[PDB]
Structure formats: C-alpha cells, structure tokens
Design a protein around this ligand. Structure first.
Ligand SMILES: O=C(O)c1ccnc(-c2cn[nH]n2)c1
Ligand code: NI
Ligand SMILES: [Zn+2]
Length: 349
C-alpha cells in the first residue's frame, strides 16, 4: 500500500491551499500519505496569500558573528570541504563581498550549465558562507509554518530537560553567495528539517532516498576509508561532497531539485541531501519531529569522534509513545526493523 505510493521515490512538489497550510503537522502527515518521504526531500510552495515578513529592508545591519570561508580540496567528483572562520561581519558587508565581481554568479543559459560550472569550479576561489546565524526573520505574529515555533513533539526535548540545541530546536539563518555548499548528510538524530528561502538567488538540492541511504554510506566509506576508520558516522561532519556523476557511476539513486525564494523544503528522517547556493540569498531552517521519527532517533548512528556532537536522549520519547517497548529497549533487546516506505501514524486523520 505504502510501497505502491511514489514507487519512484521521486522528489514531489506541493501546492497547499491556505486552509491546508494552517496546520503544519497535518500537512506533513498528508504529504507522507502521498509518499513524499520516500524521496527524502520535498518542496512545498506556500499560497501567494502568505508571507512571513512584510519587508527585508532593515537587515543590512544584522551581524553574522562567524562567517565561514569554504576551502574545497579534491578531484573527479570527490571532495572534502574545510571551514575557515572569518571575523564577524554585517549583512551589508556580506552582500558587498557576495555581489562583487570576484564572487558573483557567472552568466549561463539553462540550470544544467550553472550546475556544470559548480562542479567544475568547486575547488577554486573559496566563497564565504554566512552560516549558522542564530535568529529568525518571521514576524512575531505569523502562525502558519513558523520555524521559530512549529509545535511538534521535538518540543518535548526542551519541555523535559530545558536543553536548547542551536539550529535543532532553535532557528538558524543562512546567508549564501555563489558556490557556497552544504555537504552530504542527514539531520542530527536523523530528524526532519524545514528550510525556507526568504530571499535571493536559488538554492539547488540533491537527495538520496532513505531506502537507499545505506548504499550511499557504503560508497562513502569506500572512497574515504581513513575517515571511516576514525569515525562511525563521518558524514555527520558535513565536509564530504560527492558529484551526481559519481553517484550515477556507482548506481546510487538520487534526485535533484532547485529551491526558489519563498519556497519551503522538507527533509525526512535518514534522507541524505547536499547542494549549493546560486548567489546572494538568505535561508531559515530548523529540525522537527513526527511520531515516525522516534524509531529513527532510537537507531541513529552518531558521530563517535567528537564529544561536542548533538545527542538527544530518546528515553522520554520511548516512555511516552512506545511504553510497551521501554523495558525491552532499555534492555537493548528491541530489534524493531524500520520500513522506510511507511507514512507517520498521524496520517490516519
Ligand atoms: O546550507 C544550507 O542551506 C543547508 C541546507 C541543508 N542542510 C543544512 C544543515 C546544516 N546542519 N544540518 N543541516 C544547511
Ligand atoms: Ni540538512
Ligand atoms: Zn565524528
């Protein structure tokens, strides 16, 4: 039944009405009832009626406390990205650098051309990314899909322990320029993410279906045996770039999609994704959860080589939503096998 929905595991695109848009978790359950999650990634175009902010005309004074310069080393589709933190910088300061001749977007016809230039010039002329900036650009009154307060069960982490995890249960802003990249990865604890492109040039995405996620990991371990030896989940470092041609060459299924300003992207549990920004832009994102995520959370394979990595206690989720398995899980005997095709329980409504 779930297997017969989106059997291609293709990236789907949704155009909700304004009435459908009002209840966030309900629409996530809906697009899962249509098999969107099998792709790992889905686009959701909100009604023209909607806007999270009246104008972006005041933000040139907003500070980017830790701009990152992205050095990239590699060849023939395989790359490792190193981060060089620059000194703090305002948005107007950043836009100036980004729109300057040295860093601006090259001219091109179709997207496949800009794509080709991206993978051709990835290692040259290191751009700067205004990444992981704590904040939101939603006006305080917007209630539909407000990244600052989605009200999903991920809120249970803060409710129970008081713990905030920047960018995970709090929002991050991302100021991009041409050729700034996000490496191949899943979310922390294999959560969902929501990404909103407030303004600027597009952001292109690659996705690998969760049901093929393990195939991508085997390939990545093969190409980076050193990194694999020293960490059980090195892709969570978010340093590893792999071109779509390399994926084709080794039979990994994937899809691609380009995100325009004013569009949402949803990534799903264990959905590997990567991509790049076309030019100057601004994006807001955070993580969230559904009842389906819990099993993913229990089984997420985490980065083993840093003490500073994101680790969420699953205990309170298992107690509340899987009480009959708590004794078993806590005794390490819960061998529930995940079916990636199944939609989340809430989609019964
Ligand atoms: O750089 C982005 O726009 C982006 C896109 C997709 N994922 C992330 C990200 C950063 N940490 N977890 N996920 C960042
Ligand atoms: Ni992500
Ligand atoms: Zn690690």
């Amino acid at each position: 039944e779930s297997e017969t929905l989106n059997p291609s595991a293709r990236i789907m695109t949704f155009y909700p009405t304004m009435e459908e848009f009002r209840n966030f978790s309900r629409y996530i359950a809906y697009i899962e009832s249509q098999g969107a999650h099998r792709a790992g990634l889905a686009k959701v175009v909100p009604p023209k009626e909607w806007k999270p902010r009246a104008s972006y005309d005041d933000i040139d004074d907003l500070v980017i406390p830790a701009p990152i310069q992205q050095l990239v080393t590699g060849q023939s589709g395989l790359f490792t990205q190193y981060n060089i933190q620059k000194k703090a910088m305002t948005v107007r300061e950043f836009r100036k650098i980004a729109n300057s001749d040295k860093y601006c977007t090259p001219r091109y016809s179709e997207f496949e051309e800009l794509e080709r230039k991206y993978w051709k010039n990835l290692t040259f002329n290191p751009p700067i990314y205004g990444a992981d900036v704590n904040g939101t650009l939603y006006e305080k009154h917007v209630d539909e899909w407000n990244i600052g307060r989605l009200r999903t069960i991920l809120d249970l982490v803060e409710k129970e322990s008081g713990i905030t995890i920047e960018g995970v249960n709090t929002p991050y802003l991302y100021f991009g320029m041409w050729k700034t990249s996000f490496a191949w990865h899943t979310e922390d604890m294999d959560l969902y993410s929501i990404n909103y492109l407030h303004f600027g040039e597009p952001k292109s995405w690659y996705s690998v279906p969760p049901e093929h996620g393990k195939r991508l990991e085997r390939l990545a371990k093969g190409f980076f045996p050193g990194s694999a030896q020293s960490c059980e989940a090195f892709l969570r470092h978010k340093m590893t770039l792999i071109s779509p041609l390399m994926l084709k060459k080794y039979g990994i299924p994937f899809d691609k999609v380009t995100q325009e300003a004013g569009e949402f992207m949803i990534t799903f549990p264990y959905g590997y994704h990567a991509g790049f920004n076309h030019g100057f832009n601004c994006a807001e994102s955070t993580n969230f959860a559904t009842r389906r995520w819990i099993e993913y959370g229990k089984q997420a394979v985490l980065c083993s080589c840093r003490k500073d990595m994101v680790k969420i206690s699953m205990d309170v989720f298992v107690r509340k939503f899987q009480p009959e398995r708590y004794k078993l899980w806590k005794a390490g005997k819960d061998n529930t096998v995940i079916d990636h095709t199944l939609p989340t329980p809430e989609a019964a409504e």
